[PDB]
Write a protein that binds this ligand. Structure first.
Ligand SMILES: [Ca+2]
Ligand SMILES: [Ca+2]
Ligand SMILES: [Ca+2]
Ligand SMILES: [Ca+2]
Lengths: 341, 344
């Protein structure tokens, strides 16, 4: 049922638009985005032509593949991420906060998160009531009643006393997850947290420490993981080297290789958004944007076939979220930021 | 009757190993060097001395000297540290010290006197222009120390800049007044003393939020105006999680370090890091030079020039991996000496 958008202009408040050319042009929106705005929540659902977004605390829905956006509800948090689930369902959650809710069509059920500091959420494609969640100590939690109740699952990803930035769940297999921590680098599980294996390759120095700020298992190939981190040995004081790179694993998160470096031409931060292509395992989108000096936003496209990074530029202050049209993934939905300087 | 003081370099190429060159046009062109800088190299130490046409540099562990305004560089000695910074004193003297280390030595002409630092984690050194043998030093706990015998012996001076358990990225001394110093802390923002650390005023303006936490990584008092201070920091409130904002800016004070205003933001056109080198003009209080460089994708080095008259930043670009130190010709400050980096 899914189709490409049958429009060139979007009817909505300006928080969500789309591009058909990797950001070279953005569809005009009827509304003008107002400061202060972030759009951290944006997903395509399995339901044909249906998307959800959260613009600040406003949950929005489109049922015509992004041509029209309408308010559904106001959520109890002003900064939520979305994770799609089977059957017109999604989970809304505050990254590094405690807010957690379930969306069923347009109905919102606020849940009791088992963690006050959520760093990842994953859903079971085969079992729509099955959902997992990670806390910032590296503990995974499991629910089989659509998030109504929760049990701890498995062991801590890096053992006790660790600070975990992120857990990315393989969309094809919730038993497969990657964790990124402070000084502890990366870890990977394939048995739902029963055992964890430390990743290598995030430092150019054997056994070197690193921060793994963000990770994303490719929906295109369970063996491909994209990551953002700092090699703490490379970032030795007085070196003046930041040590910040993007990385790629091709063995499911066991070993990583540097693929992009933090430069003015490929600008990285500790918060760079990672958007792997859902169909091409070679392709990673990422972005940089700032309102300062009205610099605008760079939308980057990495392709592992050559290792090269292309970029387009637009005038918005940032892109907070990216989703892909399932029928034509070259159509990309962009959730936008506007901050008044 | 003539004196023969400082002059601009009377040469077109530099005879030396390639760690130090000069520019007459803010980095648009760099003087060629006879030698080719080799990996792995950093030149963290570089100063112009008071003595006519004399400079010192440290290229890794090699102390180097020039007596012809940078046209010829020769080895002086191998130092006990491979990463040292230089602070000029009067006449022919400088102090060599390892930032965030314990190595400390005095250079007089070509003579190196190894000293015993009162701190194993040095974050700042300042010299007294009026008293040749008077020097001060800061440790990473925020303690200042005082020596009146050219660094041979030391006594603690004043109180900790921030207090117990609050460590310090830097202490910058006013070159015109060793009683005036700026301290930069981890989450504790900035402080300033005008009485040699007896009292410390907490700075404002490093966070856009009143009382907000911040990191003050680097600070430099203008040699052209004791009230002008340039600084590198992160506004930790602005850098809130999920905001995506890095919170990193350059700042300027016009009251000696009591209050700061943002002047430059971290963008691809004005690239900042937690280690951005700060080099205020020695003669124009409006002008600050700073640097960004990386060898990744052979990006090279941007040398930036901020001017408070207009608020604008200009830049030049060169192909080196980085500029690790900057000094100015005292007689002709548009002549700038650059210490360079090279990494495989
Ligand atoms: Ca960067
Ligand atoms: Ca704007
Ligand atoms: Ca930067
Ligand atoms: Ca090089």
């Amino acid at each position: 049922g899914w189709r490409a958008p049958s429009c060139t202009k979007v009817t909505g408040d300006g928080a969500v638009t789309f591009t058909t050319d990797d950001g070279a042009t953005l569809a005009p929106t009827t509304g003008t985005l107002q400061s202060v705005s972030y759009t951290h929540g944006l997903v395509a659902l399995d339901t044909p032509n249906t998307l959800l977004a959260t613009h600040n605390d406003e949950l929005q829905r489109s049922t015509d593949a992004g041509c029209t956006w309408t308010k559904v509800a106001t959520l109890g948090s002003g900064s939520t991420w979305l994770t799609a689930a089977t059957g017109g369902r999604a989970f809304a959650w505050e990254k590094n906060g405690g807010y957690l809710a379930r969306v069923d069509g347009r109905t919102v059920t606020k849940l009791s998160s088992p963690s006050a500091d959520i760093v990842g959420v994953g859903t079971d494609k085969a079992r729509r009531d099955h959902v997992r969640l990670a806390g910032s100590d590296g503990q995974l939690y499991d629910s089989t009643d659509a998030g109504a109740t929760w049990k701890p699952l498995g062991k801590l990803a890096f053992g006790p006393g660790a600070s975990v930035y992120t857990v990315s769940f393989d969309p094809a297999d919730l038993d497969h997850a990657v964790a990124g921590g402070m000084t502890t680098g990366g870890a990977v599980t394939t048995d739902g947290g029963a055992t964890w294996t430390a990743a290598t390759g995030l430092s150019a120095t054997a056994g070197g420490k690193s921060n793994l700020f963000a990770a994303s298992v490719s929906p295109a190939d369970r063996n491909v993981v994209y990551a953002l981190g700092i090699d703490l040995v490379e970032a030795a004081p007085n070196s003046g080297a930041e040590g910040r790179h993007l990385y790629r694993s091709t063995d499911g998160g066991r070993t990583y290789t540097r693929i992009v470096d933090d430069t003015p031409d490929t600008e990285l931060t500790n918060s760079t958004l990672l958007a792997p292509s859902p169909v091409d395992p070679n392709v990673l989108y990422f972005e940089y944007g700032t309102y300062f000096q009205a610099y605008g936003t760079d939308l980057y496209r990495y392709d592992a076939r050559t290792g090269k990074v292309g970029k387009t530029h637009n005038a918005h202050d940032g892109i907070s979220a990216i989703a892909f049209n399932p029928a034509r993934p070259s159509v990309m939905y962009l959730g936008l930021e506007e901050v008044q300087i």
